[PDB]
Design a protein around this nucleic acid. Structure first.
Lengths: 317, 589, 589, 160
RNA sequence: UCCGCGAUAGCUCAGUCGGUAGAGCAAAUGACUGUUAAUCAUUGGGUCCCUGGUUCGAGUCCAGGUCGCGGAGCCA
RNA sequence: UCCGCGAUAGCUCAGUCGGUAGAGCAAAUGACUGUUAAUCAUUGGGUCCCUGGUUCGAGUCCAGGUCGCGGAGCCA
C-alpha cells in the first residue's frame, strides 16, 4: 500500500489592519465591534489591499524558495453563505503571490525529507456561526481577516511526515513572524487530501478531503484512521465516493458532513475592483536581505561550526 | 457441621455451647487473653481464649487474617463496660473450647470496614474478597429478599415464570445491539435482547393470560454513571386488562414488597398526569419529597416594559414560571450566583429573582433590580398566587418551554435538597397521560415511546388533531427516579393503520421493519398491556446504595469492561477462523 | 373484566352468570342452535346460542376460528346425552346472554385440534399460535410450577438467589465459547458462560454460605436431537458441607418437587458406586426401571480353545460378561440377528448366546452352537450364578471392558424396552464413587470432569497409585438419564499440587489457564462443593415430553436457530465496522 | 479461474474416456487430481505463496475448494501475517481447508536413472501406426456435428 | 492545542531555594489478662510513570513521550 | 463422483407403458335444533424444484442445474 496525501494550510497573518478593511485583527468576546463598513459589504463600498499583508506574503515566498510571479491578480470565489458578506471570497485563481517552493522537514527516521509546496496565495476570512436560540448568530469580527493559503504538493506520504510538515510550517512561520502559530486561539488551520493506492495498479481509491484539523495528534490519528478506512473500502470494493469528511477527537471516528454530489463551480474571474499587484525584483532584493536565518538550517549550523549534538541543537534552535 | 451463625448470637442462647465456622476478621493478642473476631454471612462475633487450655492457645497464636476456621465454645455474657454497639451480636462472647483451622489464608489485599483507603479500581479487581465485607453482603442479601418477595407476589397472582431466548434477531432503530457471530451461519449474527418486549407480546398472542420474567438485558450504548451494559429487568405483560387493573396489581406489588422487606407502608399512590407534572415541576419524574412547586405567571406579563419576560410571554413556544423558596431571603449573593450558573447549564439565558421582605409597602417592599419594569398590581397578584409571604425569595425562569421546565425543575430539586426542605419519608407516584407525538428536530411528527402505544381517543379523533391525543402509557416514579414503566398495546387493525398513516410510514417500512410482528398481530391478538422495572435501580433505592454497581454481584466499569476477570480478552486465531470473521489490526508504516 | 376461566367451570356454579374471555377453538353451526368452544389459559368450555336473541346469534354466525371474544352467560347443567368425557369442563355449558368480538382473527396456519399431523418446520414457523394448543401450554405452565417449587425450596433453606454476569472473558480447553465483539475494546471479545462454575466458587470465597441460581448457559458445540445451544441450568454451590449434606438437601429437593407438582413419592434414593454400576449395568447412568442385570462369568473360562471368549479372558484389559433375559426363549433367530447387528454397532465381533431349557438333562439340554467348546461343570456353575431357571435365555459379551460394557449395557436397555419388562414408574438414583483418571488417547492420565475435584484419599496415597483413586463426584439419574451433577471441590494447596503433578501440567499452563482462579483460591477459600441440573431435561421428564423443544418457549432447530424470527440474521456494514470487524468465509491459515 | 479448471478436468476426463485409457469413474477411484493454486495482486510479482491442495474428487469439490482457497490466500496476503508453504486437503463436509503435513524443508526424493530398467525407444513408426489408430476427438467431433451435419450446439454436444 | 491537579512499598499518601525512597495501615519477631479500627519495640520490603539529557550526585532540574480527572478552545 | 428415496394448493399426500394439478383437512356460500375432531352440497384456490430440449400436447420422457435424508467412494 502507498498513501499519497496533501495539505491545505490556512495561516492567519499577524497584521494590525485587515487585508482590505481598516478594522483591527485580534478581537475579544465583543461581537461586531471589529467591523467597519468595508467588512459588512455595504453597497458602493470598495476594498484596498493591505501593504504588510503582501509584504509578509512575498516574505514567506522568499523564505520557501519559490518562484514568485511578477504579477498576481485577485479573483472572486462566488458562493452564498451567511458568514460571507459580499457573496464571494476574494482569493487568487491565476497568478498567486508565491508558487512552487520546497520545505525541508526533519523527522525521526534519519533523513530530513524535502516536501513540495505548489502555491501560497492571499485569501480573506469570513464570519462565524454560534450555538444559540429559534435562529442563529453570525459574528463578522474575524471576517475580512487576511489569510495565507499554503497548499503543499502531493509529495507528502505518511502521516508522521504530515505532522512533520505541519510542524515545519509552524516553525518557519513562527520564525518569520507572520502568524502567531498558536492553534488554540484559532490562527493556524489545515486540511488533508488523503488518497491511498495499491502498489502496482494505476487504479486507486477515491480522494478524501478531511477539513478542520486542529492539533498535530489530531492530524496523525485522523489521517491514519482515514487511510485504513480507505484501505478497507478498496479491499471490499463497494462504492468509492468523494466526500467532505470531519474528525472528532472524542470517538476517533470520521464522519461525513457533506457528500460531494458534484464539483462546486465557484465561478472564478479576475476582480474588477482590484488591479493586479506587481512585485518587482527590488522588493525581493530588500526583503531577502531582511530574511532571517531558517531554523532547519540553524540547527544544522549548530551542528557544523559549534560543537553540539543533534538534540541540543534542535531544542536550542 | 455448624451449630449457629456468628452474627445470630442473641443474648438468649446463654449457657449453651455452639460450633461456628467462618473467616478470621482481625485478631487481638494480649498474651494472657486472645480475642478473635469470626465473620460469616450473618455478621461478626467475638470468641475469647484463655490459656487454661493452652492447646487451643497454640491453635490461637498461629491463626492470622481471613483464616477459615471452625470454633466450638460456650457463650458467656460479657461485662457492662465491654459491650459493643457496632457488633449486632456484641453483647455476648464465646469462650473457645476447641479450635480447628479448616483452611489457611494469604494476606487479604485490602482491609474490611473504614477508613481503610481502598480505591474503586482495586476494590473491583479483587471483588471476591470485597463481598466478604458485611455491608456489601447485606446489600446483595437484601436484593435476594426483594426478588423473593416479588416472585412470591407475582406467583400468587397467577403469573407464569416463562423463559425467553437471549440469542435473537438484530434490527436497527431502537439501540445498538450486541452481536454474536454465527458458527453455523457464516455472515449472520445473533443479537442480545434490549427487552423481552416482542417475545412477551408473542406470549400474549400465545394465549398465556399473564406473564412475568426477571430477564437479563443488554445495551451496546455509551454509558452514563449508574448505567451498566448488562442490566436486569422485571418484565410484566397481561391480557384482557385495562390500565387501571395493571397499575392496581403493580402498585399492590410495590407496597407488599416494601412492607415485606423494609417494613414501610405507602398508603395510596397518587396518579398524576404528564401535563400537570410538566406544569408544576417541569419534569416527567417529579420528586414528591420536595414540596416546592413551579407556578406559571406569564399571562399577566405580556404587555410589559421588561423584555426578557415579555419576549417569551407573547411567544407561544415557551413560558415564564416562578419558584418560591420560603425563608430563603437570608441567602447570600454567592449562592445566588452559583444557582444562576447552575441553571445556566440547562440553557437558561438568566435566572431572574425577587427578594420578598415587606408586603404592605408595595414596590418599596420588594428589593430587586427587576421590580421597576413591572407594575404594582401584577406584582401583588403574582405574590398572591405563588403563596409567598414575608422572608421569602421568588425566582423566575422565562424562556422556551423545554428550557424553563428543565432549568427550573432542576433548580427546584437542587435548592430542594440544599436547604433541606423535604420530608424524609418515602414518596411514590404514577405518571400517566403522556402525549402521543412530538416534532423531530427537522420537522414532522413521531411517537415518543412506540407506535404500538394505545391512544386514549378513537382513530377518528386521532386522525382529527393528533396533537390533542394522550397515550395510555405509564411510568412509576419513586424519589424523583423512574423505577420503570410500560403501556397497553394496540391490537386494532384500523387503529394501527391510523397511527401508521399519521406518522408518514408507507407499507414498505411497515413490512421491512415490523412485518413479522404485524404478522403475529394479524392471527388474533387479545387486548394486552404491560410494564417493566429496572430491578437494579429498585434494589439500589431499597438498599440506599450510592451507585448501581453496589447492588450487582460482579459489575463492570463505565467502559463496559470488568477489571477482575480482565474481560473482554483476546482470543486465538483458530476460534476466530471457525466463526467466519476477521480482525483488522494491521501494521502501518 | 373476566369473571371466571373457561376451563375452571365446575358443576357447583349452577344458577350463576359468568363472563369469560378467550379464543374460538372450533365452531359448530346447526342453524337452530350454535355451539362455541371457547379456549383460555385454563382450558376449553362450551357456549350455546338459541335464536331467542337473534342479535347475539348474529354476533355468533359471523364469528370464526381463533376469534378473540368476550361472552357473558349462564352456566347450564347439560342433558344426559350431551355430556363430554374428553372436556374437563365437559359437564356444563353456558347459554350466551351477550357476546362481543374483542378482535377478529385471520385463518390460523395450522389447526389447534388434537392429533392433526401438521409437520414440525411449520410448527416452528408459527410458534406463537402453536403454544395456544392446551398440551404445550400445560407443559410450559408445568415448567413454571416446577421452577416455582424449586425456588421456594432453595429460598426456604437459606440459599441466596444471586445473579452472575453473562459477558465474560474467553478461554480454551473446556468448550467453544460464543463470542461477542466489543465496541469499546477493538480486537477483544466477550464470551458467554458454559456454567456459573467460576462465579459460584468466587461466591463461596466471597463469604456467601449457600448459593443457588437458575442461569442461562451457552455451548458452541455441534447439535443433536436432545441438545440445544441455549439451555437453562439450576446451579447450586455450598460452603462448609460434605458430600452427604449436599446429596441430602438436593435429594430432599427432588422429592419435595415431585410431590408438589406430579404428586408422586420417592422413598429414598439408593446410592450406587460407579464401579458397581458399570459392573452390573455397564453404564454411568443406570435405568433402574429395567430389572435386567449384567453378571460377570469370565473367571471360570480362563483357558478354553474358543478364542472370542479366551482372547479377552486372559487379557486383563477386558472382560466376558453374561446377560439373562427371562421368558425370552421363544425368540426367533431373526430378532437375535437384529440384536447381534445392534451390539455390532458398538464394535462387538459377536453376540454369543445360550438357550437354557432343561438344566437337569445335561449336555442335551442346552441348545447352542457354542456349548460344545465349553465344559459341563463351568456351564452348570454359570447357570447357578446367573439366577437362571426354566425358560430364560443367557447372552454373552466377550471383549474389551469398554466394548462389553457399552454393547451389553445398551443391548440390556434395548431388550428392556422391547420386551416390556420394566414397570413404567419413576426410578431415581445417585451415582457415586467415580475414578479419578482415564487415559487420553496419546497417553498419560486425565480427570473425566475437572482437576479440581476432591479425591477420597490423601495426596500421598494419591501420588502412590493414581489408578486406584476414586473421586468425590456425584450424578443424579432418573429413568437412565442424567438429570445433573457436581462434586466437592479442592481447597488444599498440597492436594492441588499433588493432582497438578500427577496430571503432568507445569506451572506455565497452570497460571495461563487457571491463574486468576488459583489466585482467588489463595486468599482464603472455605470448604465448598456443588452441583448443577439441566432444568430443560428435568421439565422434559416431568412432562413426559419427547423432545426438549416441547419444554422450551421458543426453541431453536438442530442447526442453531429458530425459523420463526429468522435468527441469526444479517447486520448492516455500519454496525459491522463500528464493532471493528469484517466478515469472511471459513478457511484461514 | 476455477471454472476453467473444472472445464479442464472435464476435458481430460472426456478425452481419456474416448481414448479408452481410463474408466473415468472418479467414484471407483480411477481418476484423481491435485491443484497447485497461487494468487498474486496485479502489479506486484510479490506475495502469494503457493498452496497445493491434494485429493480432489468431483468437479464440484474442485470448484468449491479452489474458490475457498483463492479467497483464503487473498485474505492471508491482505493481513500479511505468515505466508507458509504447506500441502493442504479439502473436505466437502465443512468446506474448509485442512493441513495434512507441515513442510519443514524441501523433501529430497533423490532422483536418478533406474539401473535395472533400460530406456524404452519409441520410433516414429510406432507413432505412425498409432496415429492411424487414433480415434476422432470428441471436441472436434461435436463441432463436426455442427458443421457438416445439420445440428444444434446442445444436442450435438450431448450426442458427442 | 492550551490551563490546573495527579502517577512514589500490599493499600493510602507526604517529600524545601537538587544530597541512601519516609509515615499510617498491613506483614514478620517479641512484649503485655479486656481489647473490641488494640498498643508498644524491633525487623523485612519497593523501577520514585517511560526515554534521553543536566550535575560530583537525582524522586527533585531541562526536553520529548504514556495514562487518569476536570476546565478552555475548535466544530468553514 | 456414484446408488436409493424425495420437492406437486394454507397443511398432508397420491398421480400406470405421455392426454386441464386430484383427494383428506382447511377456507367461502347455502342447508339442517344437540353437536361435541359435526355432517352434506356447491364454489374459490396452486410456477407440478429451476432452465433448456422432445412431442400435436407435458407433473410424466431426455440433458444440465438447486435443495433435504441415508449409503458408497476418496482421504499419495
Amino acid at each position: 500500500w502507498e498513501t499519497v496525501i496533501g495539505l491545505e494550510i490556512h495561516a492567519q497573518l499577524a497584521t494590525q489592519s485587515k487585508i482590505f478593511s481598516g478594522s483591527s485583527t485580534a478581537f475579544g468576546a465583543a461581537p461586531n465591534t471589529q467591523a467597519s463598513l468595508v467588512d459588512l459589504a455595504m453597497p458602493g463600498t470598495l476594498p484596498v489591499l493591505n501593504e504588510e499583508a503582501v509584504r509578509m506574503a512575498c516574505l514567506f515566498g522568499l523564505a520557501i524558495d519559490a518562484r514568485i510571479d511578477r504579477q498576481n491578480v485577485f479573483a472572486r470565489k462566488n458562493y452564498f453563505y451567511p458568514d460571507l458578506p459580499k457573496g464571494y471570497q476574494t482569493s487568487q485563481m491565476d497568478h498567486p503571490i508565491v508558487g512552487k517552493g520546497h520545505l525541508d522537514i526533519t523527522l525521526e527516521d534519519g533523513t530530513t525529507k524535502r516536501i513540495g509546496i505548489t502555491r501560497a496565495h492571499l485569501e480573506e476570512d469570513a464570519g462565524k456561526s454560534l450555538h444559540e436560540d429559534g435562529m442563529s448568530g453570525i459574528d463578522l469580527n474575524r471576517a475580512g481577516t487576511p489569510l495565507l493559503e499554503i497548499v503543499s504538493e502531493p509529495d507528502i506520504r505518511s502521516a508522521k511526515e504530515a505532522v512533520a510538515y505541519v510542524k515545519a510550517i509552524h516553525a518557519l512561520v513562527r520564525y518569520l513572524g507572520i502568524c502567531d502559530g498558536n492553534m488554540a486561539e484559532g490562527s493556524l488551520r489545515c486540511d488533508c487530501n488523503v488518497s491511498v493506492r495499491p502498489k502496482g495498479q494505476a487504479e486507486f481509491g477515491t480522494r478524501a478531503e478531511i477539513k478542520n484539523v486542529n492539533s498535530f495528534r489530531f492530524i496523525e490519528k485522523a489521517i491514519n484512521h482515514e487511510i485504513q478506512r480507505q484501505i478497507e473500502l478498496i479491499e471490499d470494493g463497494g462504492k468509492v465516493v468523494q466526500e467532505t469528511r470531519l474528525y472528532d477527537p472524542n470517538k476517533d471516528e470520521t464522519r461525513s458532513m457533506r457528500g460531494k454530489e458534484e464539483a462546486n463551480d465557484y465561478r472564478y474571474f479576475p476582480c474588477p475592483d482590484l488591479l493586479p499587484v506587481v512585485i518587482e525584483p527590488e522588493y525581493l532584493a530588500k526583503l531577502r536581505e531582511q530574511l532571517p536565518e531558517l531554523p532547519v538550517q540553524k540547527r544544522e549550523r549548530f551542528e557544523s561550526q559549534y560543537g553540539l549534538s543533534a538534540y541540543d541543537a534542535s531544542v536550542l534552535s | 457441621m455448624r451449630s449457629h451463625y456468628c452474627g445470630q448470637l442473641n443474648e438468649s442462647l446463654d449457657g449453651q455451647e455452639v460450633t461456628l465456622c467462618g473467616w478470621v476478621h482481625r485478631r487481638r493478642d494480649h498474651g494472657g487473653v486472645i480475642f478473635l473476631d469470626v465473620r460469616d454471612r450473618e455478621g461478626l462475633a467475638q470468641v475469647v481464649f484463655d490459656p487454661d487450655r493452652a492447646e487451643t492457645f497454640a491453635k490461637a497464636d498461629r491463626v492470622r487474617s481471613e483464616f477459615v476456621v471452625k470454633i466450638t465454645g460456650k457463650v458467656r455474657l460479657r461485662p457492662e463496660g465491654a459491650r459493643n454497639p457496632n457488633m449486632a451480636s456484641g453483647s455476648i462472647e464465646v469462650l473457645g473450647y476447641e479450635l480447628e483451622v479448616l483452611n489457611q489464608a494469604e494476606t487479604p489485599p485490602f482491609p474490611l470496614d473504614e477508613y481503610s483507603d481502598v480505591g474503586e479500581e482495586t476494590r473491583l479487581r479483587y471483588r471476591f474478597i470485597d463481598l466478604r465485607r458485611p455491608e456489601m453482603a447485606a446489600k446483595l442479601k437484601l436484593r435476594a429478599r426483594i426478588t423473593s418477595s416479588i416472585r412470591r407476589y407475582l406467583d400468587d397472582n397467577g403469573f407464569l415464570d416463562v423463559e425467553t431466548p437471549i440469542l435473537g434477531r438484530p434490527t436497527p432503530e431502537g439501540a445498538r445491539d450486541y452481536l454474536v457471530p454465527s458458527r453455523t451461519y457464516p455472515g449472520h449474527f445473533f443479537a442480545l435482547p434490549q427487552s423481552p418486549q416482542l417475545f412477551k407480546q408473542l406470549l400474549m398472542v400465545a394465549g398465556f393470560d399473564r406473564y412475568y420474567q426477571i430477564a437479563k438485558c443488554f445495551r451496546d450504548e455509551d454509558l452514563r454513571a449508574d448505567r451498566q451494559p448488562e442490566f436486569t429487568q422485571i418484565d410484566i405483560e397481561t391480557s384482557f386488562l385495562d390500565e387501571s387493573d395493571i397499575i392496581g396489581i403493580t402498585e399492590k406489588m410495590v407496597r407488599q414488597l416494601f412492607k415485606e422487606v423494609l417494613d414501610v407502608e405507602f398508603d395510596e399512590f397518587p396518579h398524576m398526569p404528564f401535563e400537570e407534572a410538566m406544569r408544576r415541576y417541569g419534569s416527567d419524574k417529579p420528586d414528591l419529597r420536595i414540596p416546592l412547586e413551579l407556578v406559571d405567571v406569564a399571562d399577566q406579563l405580556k404587555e410589559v416594559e421588561f423584555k426578557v419576560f415579555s419576549g417569551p410571554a407573547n411567544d407561544p413556544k415557551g413560558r415564564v414560571a416562578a419558584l418560591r423558596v420560603p425563608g430563603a431571603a437570608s441567602m447570600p449573593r454567592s449562592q445566588i450566583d452559583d444557582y444562576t450558573k447552575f441553571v445556566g447549564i440547562y440553557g437558561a439565558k438568566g435566572l431572574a429573582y425577587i427578594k420578598v421582605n415587606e408586603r404592605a409597602k408595595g414596590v418599596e417592599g420588594l428589593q430587586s433590580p427587576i421590580v421597576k419594569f413591572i407594575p404594582e398590581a401584577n406584582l401583588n397578584v403574582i405574590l398572591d398566587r405563588v403563596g409567598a409571604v414575608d422572608g421569602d425569595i421568588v425566582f423566575f425562569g422565562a424562556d422556551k418551554a423545554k428550557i424553563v421546565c428543565d432549568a427550573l425543575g432542576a433548580l427546584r430539586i437542587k435548592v430542594g435538597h440544599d436547604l433541606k426542605l423535604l420530608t424524609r419519608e418515602w414518596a411514590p407516584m404514577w405518571v400517566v397521560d403522556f402525549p402521543m407525538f412530538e416534532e423531530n428536530d427537522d420537522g414532522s411528527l413521531s411517537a415518543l415511546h412506540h407506535p404500538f402505544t394505545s391512544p386514549k381517543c378513537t382513530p377518528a379523533e386521532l386522525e382529527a388533531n393528533p396533537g390533542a391525543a394522550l397515550s395510555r402509557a405509564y411510568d412509576m416514579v419513586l424519589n424523583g427516579t423512574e423505577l420503570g414503566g410500560g403501556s397497553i398495546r394496540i391490537h386494532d387493525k384500523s387503529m394501527q393503520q391510523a397511527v401508521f398513516r399519521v406518522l408518514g410510514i408507507d407499507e414498505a417500512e411497515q413490512e421491512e421493519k415490523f412485518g413479522f410482528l404485524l404478522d403475529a398481530l394479524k392471527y388474533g391478538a387479545p387486548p394486552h398491556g404491560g410494564l417493566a422495572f429496572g430491578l437494579d435501580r429498585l434494589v439500589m433505592l431499597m438498599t440506599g446504595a450510592s451507585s448501581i454497581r453496589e447492588v450487582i454481584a460482579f459489575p463492570k466499569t463505565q467502559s463496559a469492561g470488568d477489571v477482575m476477570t480482565q474481560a473482554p480478552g483476546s482470543v486465538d486465531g483458530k476460534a476466530l477462523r471457525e466463526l467466519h470473521i476477521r480482525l483488522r489490526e494491521q501494521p502501518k508504516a
